[PDB]
RNA sequence: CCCGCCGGCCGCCCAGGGAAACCGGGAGGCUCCGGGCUCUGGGGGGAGUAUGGCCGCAAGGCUGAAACUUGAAGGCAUUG
RNA sequence: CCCACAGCCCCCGCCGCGGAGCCGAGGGCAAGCUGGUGCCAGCAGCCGCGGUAAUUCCAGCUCGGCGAGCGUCGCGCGGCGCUGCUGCAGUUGAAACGCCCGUAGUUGGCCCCCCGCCGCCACGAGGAAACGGGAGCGCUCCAGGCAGGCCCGUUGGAC
């Protein structure tokens, strides 16, 4: 009946990424030098 | 009207007709990594220049060898390419021009000549040093990373005599 | 266990009597054994790709019967290309059949020069056209450094065939992959059957083979 | 063969193309003049008008509004897309109305709607739905 | 009615070659046909031919030896600038290496290479390769 | 009687062509895409409708829109 | 230092603020984890999602594109060989007037060895620059401008 009825976690304070060109450098070591695939749920289970 | 209306202006780069193409993305990223490129407009500028060279070479090649226009334009183009160092000295045929690639353009950048002289630890180190103004191209200090160095000045690119 | 040839050509190939695949193509012998192509390519120089995978259904008394059809190409990036198809109830066996069929049929691709003759050939010899279904393809020689001007699918074939510079034009319902690939394959196959004046030289036949 | 090909036949070719190029629906709609007069937007990017009433295989009712263009005085309906934006529009509020992606034609499952609402009281709808700005002045 | 004798002659020749014959007949015996055949013969496509008189549009006989793939005419003779030939070359012939385009000039019937050498142009008659 | 020539009406068909059914006395000689002349068509509806003009005793014929609407309508063929 | 006066660029000494957003993650189209709601609210250029795992809505995490720019709306070009001169189609998909005669119009077999005329091709004159192409010159590069060095083609600004 009430619109917006469907429409709390504190944000995780973590350091910002290295902007500028370093971001590209961050990707370069992300997949090639560092072991990859990406997107599995079980992969995040490893991350947690 | 104001005199400012007669100042000419034009763009200098192009964008790929198909943007999302995996091989192109990977190749562009790889070239950025080997040359420490900021954004992707520089590759577009390089491709623009290469396209101009190739089109001129084609038009001259369609014509006869003994065409006066052919002689004139080819001589000018060869002289410019050689003075820039992009094309090897031993080559003086217009046919070789069609085989040039943007990598030869990159190799004559200020960062490139700086690094291959072993004057810098890396492309990123070279860029940061260039910004701080520690380099004296010829006898004049230059703070433009994309400055292109001719053959006659490659032996003359040194450290700034004023830098600490 | 081992490869026991089932054909005279297979036996001769098992023996070191035949030394090159071009020695086979010159007399238009049909190929039926997949072992023959690996013997000339011991190190597995040939590449492989899976262009498409589609599902085909047949109506029956009880529900539907489904199946899978696959298209595969292979090449060593140096004047050799092949196209093949396979259909089966399961995807993997269909892919294996398609790869086997593509390996079975293979043709050489002739290459030439655009204007200046310097170094190795870099593009097609001349204009080539092919026809399959509603699709038509035109291959035009190009200058050095021009890249491959074509759609991603056709460019894959031209890459696996060992070309670097070429212009292409397409017509018809190009969204049908099988017929586009077939048309380009036919155009490439026609390459070595096109007379040119340098081949006007009159050569006497050879009794051997 | 079918077409003329003589060396002194350019006039006929020009006339034939002139006559036959009117058969295309797009060319007609663009160069004929009927649509421009019949379009309540008269070739403009978007219009400024005044709202006067709120109304709304998929079975979801879409929220829209009836509007009258200031410069034209003809009536149309424009549809407010972004969630929760019905409450942000009040009766008799100045609005700016543009078009959907398909010029002229209807878009999506919405019957009889061919426009969009992008501003109310001078504030972008997107800037308000994300809470960047606020409509406290109205 | 009959108009372009050259087109009919060329079509007959190509049809005969397709089934690998050796001798053909062509009713018209125009001068333009004769020069076209002369150029073909000199370049090495058709070898020999003879003209058979009869006082009523003489007939001509030609011999075949393969080689020839295609040959046609351009029905309305365009005007070709001396400097505007590469476009036609690319549009019509398979490759820039081989092939001959026939142009009629004030200097006589010649091939596009010859005219390119003399830096002059004219009207186009046909082509073959 | 059988061996031919011209013209006409037909059947089957190698190549070739085509999305295919099929054509093959061309629907062949065409993306390798130019013999000459004329006419018609540009997604489906609204609509061969309205409004004008001409012809006709009349019934009606020739010419011939737009607004608006819509995401498919169609061709040949395959299995049930 | 420059400037009609002031700024501003640049040079010189002292102290020294390091800051990225806009779109999207089913296909076209590069880019995936829980909580809500339940054909409601909403997304969606097209196909489509949502009637209890919602890979498409609403939030968090993660990820991708471009980048001091990003996205939306309308118009033109291209996409388009869907206006087709190059270069469409006309048995069955939309499309050969029911047939004949016939004027304007368009198109017209072969042949003459050198004369005149029209078209045609090449060259030339003559006539504005800017823009465009283009020779040469390191405004720190560049967008630009026609400069500039010492012992300069009469320094150059050609075409
Ligand atoms: Mg045609
Ligand atoms: Mg059409
Ligand atoms: Mg219609
Ligand atoms: Mg029909």
Residue ranges covered by each domain of chain C: 2-108, 109-202
Chain breaks after residues in chain C, where C lies over 2.5 Å from next N: none
Q: Beta strands D94-99 and D115-120: pairing type?
A: antiparallel
Terminal C-alpha separation, chain E: 29
Instruction: Give B147→chain C minimum CA distance, Å.
Output: 26
* Å between CA of E52 and C1' of F1: 40
Locate tokens 């399959």: which residue? C132
Residue B7, in any domain of the structure: no
Residue tagged 């350091």 (tokens) = A15
**Resolution in units of Å:** 3.1
Contact D47, D69 (CB under 8 A): yes
CB D89 within 8 A of CB D51: yes
Q: Strand G closer than 7 Å to the CB of D3?
A: yes
b vs e for D96-111, b when ≥16 Cβ sit within 10 Å of the residue's Cβ? bbebbeeeeeeeeebe
Written as six digits, the tokens of B49 are 């220049």
Contact exists between C and D (3 or more beta carbon pairs < 8 Å): no
Number of Cβ within a 10 Å radius of residue B115: 18
The span from the first CA to the last CA of chain A, in angstroms, equals 40
> Chain-centre distance of CA C88, in angstroms?
22
Residues C194, C200, C203, C209: what is their CA dihedral angle, to the nearest 10 degrees?
A: 0
| Cα A43 from chain centroid (whole Å) | 12
Chains that touch D (3 or more CB pairs under 8 A): A, E
Which are the contacts of E36, defined by CB distance < 8 A and separation ≥ 6?
A: E6, E102, E109, E125, E126
B77 touches strand G (CB under 7 A): yes
Residue D39 tokens, joined: 């379009």
Are C144 and B99 a contacting pair at CB < 8 A? yes
**Is C4 within 8 Å of C29 (Cβ atoms)?**
no
Please report, to the nearest 10 degrees, the dihedral formed by the alpha carbons of residues E26, E30, E36, E38 taken in order.
90
Would you say residue B26 lies in a domain? yes
A24·B33 Cβ contact <8 A? yes
- The structure tokens listed for D116 are 């969009």
HEC letters along chain B? CCHHHHCCCCCCCCCCCCCCCHHHHHHHHHHHHHHCCCCCHHHHHHHHHHHHHHHHHHHHHHCCCCCHHHHHHHHHHHHHHHHHCCCCCCCCCHHHHHHCCHHHHHHCEHHHHHHHCCCCCCHHHHHHHHHHCCEEECCEECCCCCCECCHHHHCCCEECCCCC
Breaks (C-N over 2.5 A) in chain A follow: 7, 36
Residue B101 and residue B49 in contact, taking contact as beta carbons nearer than 8 Å: no
D124 strand-pairing partners: D119
Overall residue count recorded for chain B in this entry: 164
Residue B146 lies in a domain: yes
B31 is a domain residue:
yes
Best CA proximity match to C184, nearest among C139, C142, C152: C139
| Residue D72 · residue D40 · CB < 8 Å | yes
| Burial tier of E118 (Cβ tally within 10 Å: 0-12, 13-18, 19+) | exposed
Handedness of CA D42, D44, D46, D49 (dihedral sign): negative
d(C-alpha C48, C-alpha C102), whole Å? 9
Calpha distance B39→B31 (Å, rounded) = 11
Report in angstroms the alpha-carbon separations of E105 from B14, C70, E79, E82, E122: 44, 58, 10, 11, 5
C-alpha–C-alpha distance, residues E18 and D136, integer Å: 87
Angle at the Cα of B137 from the Cα atoms of B136 and B140, rounded to 5 degrees = 65
Query: How many Å apart are CA E62 and CA E39, to the nearest integer?
Result: 13
Rounded Cα distance, C148 and C76, in Å? 18
Residue whose entry in the numeric block shows the structure tokens 């396979």 = C86
**What are the φ/ψ torsions at residue E20 (nearest 5 degrees)?**
65, 45
Instruction: Give the CA-to-C1' distance from D112 to F11 in angstroms.
Output: 63
Q: Give every strand in the sheet of C135-141, ordered side by side.
A: C128-132, C135-141, C166-171, C148-149
Beta strands E23-26 and E49-52, pairing class? unpaired
Strand segments, DSSP code E, in C76-181 are: 80-88, 107-108, 111-112, 123-124, 128-132, 135-141, 148-149, 166-171
Angle, CA of B78, B83 and B87, to the nearest 5°: 55
Q: Do B38 and A28 touch (CB under 8 A)?
A: no
Q: What are phi and psi of E50, to 5 degrees?
A: -135, 150
CA distance C102 to D78: 58
Strands (E), E42-114: 49-52, 59-63, 71-73, 79-80, 100-105, 108-111
Residue C30 has a CB neighbour count (10 Å cut-off) of: 9
- Whether residue C177 contacts residue C51, with contact meaning beta carbons closer than 8 Å, is answered with yes
Calculated CA dihedral for residues D98, D100, D104, D109, nearest 10 degrees: -140
- What residues have CB less than 8 Å from B73, skipping those under 6 apart? B56, B60
DSSP code for C193: G
Q: Are D80 and D118 in contact (CB under 8 A)?
A: no
- Residue boundaries of the structural domains of chain E: 1-68, 69-129
Which segments within chain C are labelled E, that is strand? 49-59, 64-75, 80-88, 107-108, 111-112, 123-124, 128-132, 135-141, 148-149, 166-171
Which of B21, B58, B100 comes nearest C143 by C-beta? B58
Q: Identify the CA nearest to E59 among candidates E50, E67, E68.
A: E50
Q: Name the minimum distance, in Å, from the CA of C116 to any CA of chain B.
A: 7
């Amino acid at each position: 009946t009430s619109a917006g009825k469907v429409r709390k976690k504190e944000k995780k304070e973590k350091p910002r990424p290295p902007r500028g060109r370093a971001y590209k450098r961050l990707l370069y070591n992300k997949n090639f030098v560092d072991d990859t695939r990406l997107g599995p749920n079980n992969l995040l289970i490893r991350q947690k | 009207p104001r005199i400012s209306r007669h100042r000419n202006s034009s763009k200098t780069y192009s964008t790929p007709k198909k943007p999302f193409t995996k091989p192109r993305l990977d190749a562009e990223l790889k070239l950025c990594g080997e040359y420490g490129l900021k954004c992707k407009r520089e590759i577009y500028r390089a491709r623009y220049m290469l396209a101009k060279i190739r089109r001129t070479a084609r038009n001259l090649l369609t014509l006869d060898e003994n065409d006066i226009k052919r002689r004139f334009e080819g001589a000018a183009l060869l002289r410019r390419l050689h003075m820039l160092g992009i094309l090897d000295e031993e080559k003086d045929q217009l046919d070789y021009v069609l085989g040039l690639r943007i990598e030869d353009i990159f190799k004559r950048r200020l960062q490139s000549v700086i690094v291959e002289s072993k004057l810098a630890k890396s492309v990123h180190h070279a860029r940061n040093m260039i910004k701080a103004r520690h380099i004296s191209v010829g006898g004049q200090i230059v703070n433009i990373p994309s400055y292109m160095v001719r053959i006659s000045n490659t032996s003359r690119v040194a450290i700034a005599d004023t830098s600490s | 266990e081992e490869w026991h040839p089932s054909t005279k050509l297979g036996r001769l190939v098992k023996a070191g009597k035949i030394e090159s695949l071009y020695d086979i193509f010159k007399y238009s012998l049909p190929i039926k054994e997949t072992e023959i192509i690996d013997y000339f390519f011991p190190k597995s120089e040939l590449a492989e790709e899976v262009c498409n995978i589609m599902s085909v259904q047949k109506q029956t008394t009880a529900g539907q019967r489904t199946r899978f059809r696959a298209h595969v190409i292979v090449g060593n990036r140096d004047g050799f290309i092949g196209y093949g198809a396979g259909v089966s109830k399961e995807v993997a066996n269909a892919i294996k059949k398609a790869a086997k069929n593509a390996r079975l049929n293979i043709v050489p691709v002739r290459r030439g020069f655009w204007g200046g003759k310097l170094g190795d050939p870099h593009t097609v010899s001349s204009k080539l056209s092919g026809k399959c279904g509603s699709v038509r393809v035109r291959l035009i020689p190009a200058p050095r450094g021009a890249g491959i001007v074509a759609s991603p699918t056709v460019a894959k074939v031209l890459e696996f065939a060992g070309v670097s510079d070429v212009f292409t034009r397409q017509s018809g319902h190009s969204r049908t992959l099988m017929n586009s690939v077939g048309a380009v394959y036919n155009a490439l196959k026609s390459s070595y059957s096109i007379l040119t004046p340098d081949l006007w030289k009159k050569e006497q036949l050879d009794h051997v083979q | 063969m079918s077409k003329t090909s003589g060396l002194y036949t350019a006039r006929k070719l020009r006339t034939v193309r002139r006559v036959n190029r009117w058969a295309d629906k797009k060319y007609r709609k663009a160069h004929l003049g009927t649509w421009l007069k019949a379009n309540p937007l008269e070739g403009a990017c978007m219009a400024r008008g005044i709202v006067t009433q709120k109304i709304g295989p998929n079975s979801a009712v879409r929220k829209a509004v009836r509007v009258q263009l200031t410069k034209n005085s003809k009536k149309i309906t424009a549809f407010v897309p972004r969630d929760g934006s019905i409450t942000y529009i009040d009766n008799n509020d100045e609005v700016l109305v543009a078009g959907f992606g398909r010029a002229g034609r209807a878009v999506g499952d919405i019957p009889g709607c061919r426009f969009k609402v992008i501003k109310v009281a001078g504030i972008g709808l997107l800037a308000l739905f994300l809470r960047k700005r606020e409509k406290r002045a109205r | 009615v009959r108009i372009n004798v050259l087109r009919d002659a060329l079509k007959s020749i190509c049809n005969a070659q397709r089934i690998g014959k050796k001798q053909v007949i062509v009713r018209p015996s125009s001068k333009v046909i004769i020069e076209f055949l002369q150029l073909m013969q000199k370049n090495g496509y058709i070898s020999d031919f003879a003209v058979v008189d009869n006082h009523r549009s003489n007939r001509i006989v030609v011999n075949l030896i393969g080689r020839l793939n295609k040959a046609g005419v351009i029905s309305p003779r365009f005007d070709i600038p001396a400097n505007d030939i590469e476009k036609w070359v690319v549009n019509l012939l398979p490759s820039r290496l081989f092939g001959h385009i026939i142009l009629t000039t004030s200097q006589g019937i010649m091939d596009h290479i010859e005219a390119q050498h003399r830096q002059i142009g004219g009207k186009v008659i046909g082509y073959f390769y």
